[PDB]
Amino acid sequence: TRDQNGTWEMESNENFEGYMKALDIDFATRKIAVRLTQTKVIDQDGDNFKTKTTSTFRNYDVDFTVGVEFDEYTKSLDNRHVKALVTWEGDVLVCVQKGEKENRGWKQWIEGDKLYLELTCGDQVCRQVFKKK
Numbered sequence: 001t002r003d004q005n006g007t008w009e010m011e012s013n014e015n016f017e018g019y020m021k022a023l024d025i026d027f028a029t030r031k032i033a034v035r036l037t038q039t040k041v042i043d044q045d046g047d048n049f050k051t052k053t054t055s056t057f058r059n060y061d062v063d064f065t066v067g068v069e070f071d072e073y074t075k076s077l078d079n080r081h082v083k084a085l086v087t088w089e090g091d092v093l094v095c096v097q098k099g100e101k102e103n104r105g106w107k108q109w110i111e112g113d114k115l116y117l118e119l120t121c122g123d124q125v126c127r128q129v130f131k132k133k
């Protein structure tokens, strides 16, 4: 399905360390994060997405329309300008973040009552899994 709506609660988080190190996040921000549950809320209506991810540490909030290129300041993360574009490849939601870092983006998809998210930067991949709540 392409319907990614709802409230999603994290059940695993693989190599978030490596992904953050690839983005040049200070050792201490990485220490704080590294581990910590999370809730992602996706409100999607056709191509229009409003997403909230929440942790006890920092929020990162992302709204976009699929197929409409937009400039992203990645505020919560690594302090950067990117040209972000979100598109569909089959039922996989794909974001390419163009700028200094190579191979920067993410891919998100649904299989069952789970949401899967693969965050990439350079040679690094972080894999998250969420359950619908």
Ligand SMILES: CC1=C(/C=C/C(C)=C/C=C/C(C)=C/C=O)C(C)(C)CCC1
Pocket (backbone or CB within 6 Å): 020, 033, 051, 053, 055, 057, 058, 059, 060, 062, 076, 077, 106, 108, 117, 119
């Ligand atoms: C690095 C980092 C974070 C992660 C940010 C990410 C990976 C956001 C991805 C959002 C997506 C892919 C939304 C798509 O719908 C947090 C949690 C703010 C904690 C502080 C450090």
